[PDB]
Amino acid sequence: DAVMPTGPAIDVLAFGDSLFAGYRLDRDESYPARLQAALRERGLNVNVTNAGVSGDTTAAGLQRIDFVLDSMAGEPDLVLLELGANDMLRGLPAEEARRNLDTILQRLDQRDIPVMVYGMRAAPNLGGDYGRSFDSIFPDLADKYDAELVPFFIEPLIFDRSLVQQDQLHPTAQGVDAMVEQTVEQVEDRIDDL
Amino acid sequence: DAVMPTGPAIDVLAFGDSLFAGYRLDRDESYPARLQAALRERGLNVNVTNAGVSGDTTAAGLQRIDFVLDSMAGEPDLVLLELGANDMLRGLPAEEARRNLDTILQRLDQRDIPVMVYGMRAAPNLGGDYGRSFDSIFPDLADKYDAELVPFFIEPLIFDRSLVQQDQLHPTAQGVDAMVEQTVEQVEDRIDDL
Ligand SMILES: [Ca+2]
Ligand SMILES: [Ca+2]
Ligand SMILES: [Ca+2]
Ligand SMILES: [Ca+2]
Ligand SMILES: [Ca+2]
Ligand SMILES: [Ca+2]
Ligand SMILES: [Ca+2]
Numbered sequence: 480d481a482v483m484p485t486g487p488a489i490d491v492l493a494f495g496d497s498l499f500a501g502y503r504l505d506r507d508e509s510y511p512a513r514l515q516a517a518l519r520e521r522g523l524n525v526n527v528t529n530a531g532v533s534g535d536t537t538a539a540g541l542q543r544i545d546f547v548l549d550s551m552a553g554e555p556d557l558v559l560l561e562l563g564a565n566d567m568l569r570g571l572p573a574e575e576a577r578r579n580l581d582t583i584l585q586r587l588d589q590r591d592i593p594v595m596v597y598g599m600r601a602a603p604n605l606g607g608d609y610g611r612s613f614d615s616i617f618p619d620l621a622d623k624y625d626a627e628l629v630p631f632f633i634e635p636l637i638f639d640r641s642l643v644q645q646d647q648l649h650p651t652a653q654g655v656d657a658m659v660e661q662t663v664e665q666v667e668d669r670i671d672d673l
Numbered sequence: 674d675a676v677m678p679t680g681p682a683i684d685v686l687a688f689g690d691s692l693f694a695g696y697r698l699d700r701d702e703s704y705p706a707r708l709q710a711a712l713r714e715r716g717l718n719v720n721v722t723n724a725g726v727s728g729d730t731t732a733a734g735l736q737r738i739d740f741v742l743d744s745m746a747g748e749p750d751l752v753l754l755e756l757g758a759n760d761m762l763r764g765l766p767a768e769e770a771r772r773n774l775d776t777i778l779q780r781l782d783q784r785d786i787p788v789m790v791y792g793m794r795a796a797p798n799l800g801g802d803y804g805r806s807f808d809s810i811f812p813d814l815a816d817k818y819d820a821e822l823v824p825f826f827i828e829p830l831i832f833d834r835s836l837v838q839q840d841q842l843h844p845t846a847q848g849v850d851a852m853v854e855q856t857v858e859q860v861e862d863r864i865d866d867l
Contacts, residue, residue, distance in 0.1 A: 489864055497843060498852075503762070503798075508846040510853065517857045523864055556867060559860075568697070568841055595863060602840035627863055633842055635851035642848035646796030647762055648827055649691060652702040654836030657829035658692075659704065663711045666753075669789060669821060670683055670717055673750055 482522030490554075491515075491527045494540065494547065495561030495597065498633065499531025503644060511559075528555070536565045537579035544583050548590065558587055559629075561597035563616065567605065573612035580616060584624040596621045597629045676716030684748075685709075685721045688734065688741065689755030689791065692827065693725025697838060705753075722749070730759045731773035738777055748786055753823075754778070755791035757810065761799060767806040774810060778818040790815040791823045 493499045493511035501509025506529065515527040530547050532539070540562045548554065560583065566576040580596075587594050598617035601610045621628040636643050650658060687693045687705035695703025705723035712719045724741050726733070734756045742748060754777065760770040774790075781788050792811035795804035815822040830836050844852060 489867065491864070501849070502843045504844075504846055504849070508849060510844075510849050513849050513853045514857065514860065517853050518861060518864065521857070521861055523861065525864060557864060593863075593867070595860065604840065627859070629856055629859060632852050632856050633844070633848075635855055636842045636844060636848055639848075639851070642845055642851055644798075644843045644845055644848075646798045647843075648830045649696045649838040649841075650698075650704075650827070650830055651836055651838055652698060654827075654830050654838075655695070655698065655702060655704050655707050657833075657836055658826050659707045659711050661829055662823055662826050663708065663715075665821070665823060666708065666789065667712060667715055667717065669787070670685070670712065670719060670751060673683070673787065 481520045484519045484522055484524040486524050489523060489525045489556050490551065491525055491557045491559065492548070492551065492555040493527050493529050493531060493559045493561070494544065495531045495559065496535040496540075496565055497531065497533040498564065498597075499529060499559070499561055500533045501529070501531065502533050503646075531561075534565055535562060536569065536571065537562045537576045537583070538566075541579045541583050544586055548592070554590060554592055556593075558592050558594040559597060560584070560587075560594050560626075561599075561632075563599040563613070567599065567601045567609075567613055570605070573601075573609055573616065576613065577616045577620070580620055581623075584620060584626065588624060594624070594626045595629050596626050598631055600631050675714050678713050678716055678718035680718050683717065683719045683750050684745070685719055685751045685753065686741070686745070686749040687721055687723050687725060687753045687755070688738065689725045689753065690729040690734075690759055691725065691727035692758065692791075693723060693753070693755050694727045695723070695725065696727045725755075728759060729756060730763070730765065731756045731770045731777075732760075735773045735777050738780060742784070742786075748784060750787070752781055752786050752788045753791060754781075754788050754820075755793075757793040757807070761793065761795050761803075761807055764799065767795075767803055767810065770807065771810045771814070774814055775817075778814055778820065782818060788818070788820045789823050790818075790820050792825050794825055
């Protein structure tokens with residue numbers, strides 16, 4: 480079933496945030512490494528460089544894109560661009576993300592490097608207006624720069640919670656209240672006893 | 674129902690990580706702020722200082738405990754100590770978390786500041802051996818230093834997903850495989866077409 484890779488080496492740069500970096504995974508388990516393996520199994524002589532940085536916003540990506548590109552052994556043949564999630568999770572304006580991704584795409588145009596734009600979706604609790612403004616960044620910019628759009632690539636995670644890390648729990652406001660109800664009697668006693 | 678607080682202020686220092694800092698929450702929604710409100714409703718004249726820092730390991734906490742204490746207007750009457758989760762989540766050695774928490778409790782003993790130790794439990798991703806060495810840190814150190822143990826105060830979060838932030842999804846290794854299966858055909862086509 481597997482096809483031996485042949486042909487000249489194809490350098491792919493995976494430029495993104497935690498979803499490329501492999502948050503809390505071994506580097507060889509991250510999306511860029513596993514994608515490399517799957518492409519090579521199909522006969523493509525591909526090397527994927529993992530330039531994912533957990534926590535990167537579109538601003539942080541723009542700040543380092545030229546350096547990351549310069550640091551490769553020649554220009555890459557293809558860039559995978561996956562940023563925006565951290566802007567949304569931090570409540571930064573959708574317009575700033577759009578502008579920073581636009582600039583990144585301008586820089587790749589200037590270097591004649593083709594790109595695939597990985598789309599991202601805003602959390603529902605940011606409201607419908609933010610959702611429409613953020614979610615449309617990716618198809619709009621893919622269209623403007625004649626890049627392919629990759630649909631939300633974490634969609635499998637939405638439909639199978641077993642595919643999502645469950646080790647790290649952050650409370651909502653109501654979760655905090657439950658934590659207080661569970662501890663206030665003990666803390667009250669301790670303070671009263673000082 | 675509320676009891677008006679009376680008497681001199683009682684200063685409580687909440688020294689911890691994201692479970693005290695209020696990760697992606699407003700200040701008034703964090704555990705230290707909600708704990709303060711609950712205690713004052715019961716008639717205690719308490720001021721809880723939120724010294725939570727998201728991301729803090731036991732080593733990071735040890736590094737800043739003296740600076741944090743030396744920056745208060747007088748020493749606190751009580752410290753709530755809540756660290757270890759980030760050591761665990763990063764697979765850092767349980768023995769080093771134990772040693773750092775021990776040193777913190779030693780410095781608090783030396784300043785005669787009472788302490789409540791907030792226990793933490795290792796995630797299942799860490800395996801049984803790690804869990805047994807990590808989970809015992811908190812009752813062991815609470816007994817050694819004659820401090821109270823607050824058992825596992827995020828217990829309500831484990832059992833009710835509605836109390837836990839769901840906006841940030843990180844794949845397991847299996848989740849990454851699913852993301853590759855969702856995108857490989859499109860990436861293969863784009864590389865083939867270069
Ligand atoms: Ca003492
Ligand atoms: Ca002592
Ligand atoms: Ca003494
Ligand atoms: Ca084709
Ligand atoms: Ca084609
Ligand atoms: Ca195509
Ligand atoms: Ca070709």
